[PDB]
Amino acid sequence: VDWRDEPEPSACEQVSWFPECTTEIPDTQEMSDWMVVGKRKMIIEDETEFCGEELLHSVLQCKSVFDVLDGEEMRRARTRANPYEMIRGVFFLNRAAMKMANMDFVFDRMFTNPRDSYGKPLVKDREAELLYFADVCAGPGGFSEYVLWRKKWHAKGFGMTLKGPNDFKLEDFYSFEPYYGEGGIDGDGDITRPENISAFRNFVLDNTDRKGVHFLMADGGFSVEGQENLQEILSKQLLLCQFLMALSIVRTGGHFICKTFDLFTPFSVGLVYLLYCCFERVCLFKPITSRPANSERYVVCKGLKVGIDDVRDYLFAVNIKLNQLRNTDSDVNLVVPLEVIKGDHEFTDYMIRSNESHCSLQIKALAKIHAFVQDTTLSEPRQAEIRKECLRLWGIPDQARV
Numbered sequence: 562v563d564w565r566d567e568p569e570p571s572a573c574e575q576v577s578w579f580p581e582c583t584t585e586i587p588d589t590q591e592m593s594d595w596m597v598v599g600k601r602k603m604i605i606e607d608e609t610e611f612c613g614e615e616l617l618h619s620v621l622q623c624k625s626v627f628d629v630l631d632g633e634e635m636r637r638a639r640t641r642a643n644p645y646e647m648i649r650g651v652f653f654l655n656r657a658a659m660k661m662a663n664m665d666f667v668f669d670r671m672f673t674n675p676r677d678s679y680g681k682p683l684v685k686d687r688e689a690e691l692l693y694f695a696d697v698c699a700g701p702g703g704f705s706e707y708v709l710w711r712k713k714w715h716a717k718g719f720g721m722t723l724k725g726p727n728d729f730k731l732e733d734f735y736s737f738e739p740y741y742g743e744g745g746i747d748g749d750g751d752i753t754r755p756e757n758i759s760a761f762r763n764f765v766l767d768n769t770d771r772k773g774v775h776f777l778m779a780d781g782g783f784s785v786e787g788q789e790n791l792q793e794i795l796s797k798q799l800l801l802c803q804f805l806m807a808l809s810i811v812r813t814g815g816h817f818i819c820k821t822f823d824l825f826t827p828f829s830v831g832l833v834y835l836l837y838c839c840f841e842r843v844c845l846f847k848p849i850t851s852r853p854a855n856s857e858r859y860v861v862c863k864g865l866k867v868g869i870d871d872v873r874d875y876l877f878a879v880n881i882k883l884n885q886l887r888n889t890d891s892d893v894n895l896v897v898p899l900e901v902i903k904g905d906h907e908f909t910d911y912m913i914r915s916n917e918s919h920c921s922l923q924i925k926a927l928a929k930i931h932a933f934v935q936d937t938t939l940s941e942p943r944q945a946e947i948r949k950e951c952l953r954l955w956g957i958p959d960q961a962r963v
């Protein structure tokens with residue numbers, strides 16, 4: 562694998578969108594046969610419905626190269642190999658915060674300055690109007706810190722995240738109501754329990770005139786140490802519930818941004834297909850603040866449509882089933898038929914092209930880290946200058962925490 566003739570790194574990033582959906586939103590009747598249960602499949606190597614075999618097998622093999630290497634040694638090389646590494650978190654509580662700073666710029670401030678379908682801003686700060694947002698799978702809270710810092714005032718947020726070591730750290734915010742699923746501070750904050758979903762949903766609706774938030778951010782993940790290649794499969798329920806939460810609390814015309822990992826499986830692509838039916842426009846995007854060797858990307862959904870209740874209730878039901886099937890030999894493996902997805906040739910084309918381009922880049926980034934492990938003299942000379950250019954472009958002042 563040759564990573565060495567890759568283009569120069571740059572603060573300039575390109576976005577590609579799914580074409581606008583041209584079909585009706587599916588109703589309950591249409592979806593009645595869509596949920597397929599089968600044996601639990603802890604196998605990723607044959608998942609080629611939306612990606613060529615050679616690319617899939619290559620990315621798996623480039624990850625597995627690291628099975629024998631000490632973690633810190635790999636990370637030290639990663640630090641040197643990533644052109645965008647030095648951005649870090651700037652003055653925010655973590656580097657995750659700068660992923661939202663990055664993407665709020667790239668998507669034309671659609672999150673901090675949301676507009677109606679005709680382009681007119683919805684929130685008038687001069688009139689003291691409130692921007693309402695939500696943040697789930699979200700502790701310690703960088704994404705929210707960013708939103709609150711950009712707005713300075715007149716931004717009301719609602720959050721839900723697991724208790725414990727990765728809970729919100731509101732005290733660490735540079736410049737907001739966490740909710741755990743039972744009222745006040747009570748509950749475990751688990752987005753996969755149906756009662757927590759419903760409770761958070763009512764909490765947010767009751768506090769937004771029953772309309773919902775201008776937008777929802779979701780950034781779910783957890784440790785997959787020792788089973789890294791299975792990440793997508795291991796995080797399938799979390800992906801579903803975040804998508805479900807978007808259809809549950811985002812107001813009409815509102816937006817949704819959510820972290821995913823690999824999107825090779827029919828389960829994952831079928832979920833993305835549902836978002837694409839439910840929103841005016843959808844994109845898959847990996848910001849340069851997301852490290853280049855990993856499977857992370859973001860699905861960005863603009864302009865939620867009217868009439869999405871049947872899809873919402875469908876996903877609510879699929880989640881209940883996923884919970885029923887935990888620790889059994891079965892699982893939900895499809896949520897939209899493959900023949901339906903691939904029947905949409907425009908969708909499928911974008912999907913394959915997205916998966917393959919991400920794989921191509923990730924393969925190079927992984928091979929590069931391996932090279933940097935073996936030769937500690939290799940370097941990315943323009944890290945500081947690239948950092949400076951990104952902050953300037955994104956409107957992020959170069960200042961530190963006191």
Ligand SMILES: C[S@@+](CC[C@H](N)C(=O)[O-])C[C@H]1O[C@@H](n2cnc3c(N)ncnc32)[C@H](O)[C@@H]1O
Nearest residue numbers: 657698700701702703704722723727751752780
């Ligand atoms: C990568 S972090 C989020 C970082 C956040 N965007 C920020 O900027 O600080 C993932 C978060 O999702 C949480 N999470 C994982 N599983 C969850 C679940 N089932 N319910 C609610 N939160 C969950 C984790 O505990 C963690 O806080």
Ligand code: NA
Nearest residue numbers: 850851852857
């Ligand atoms: Na990252």
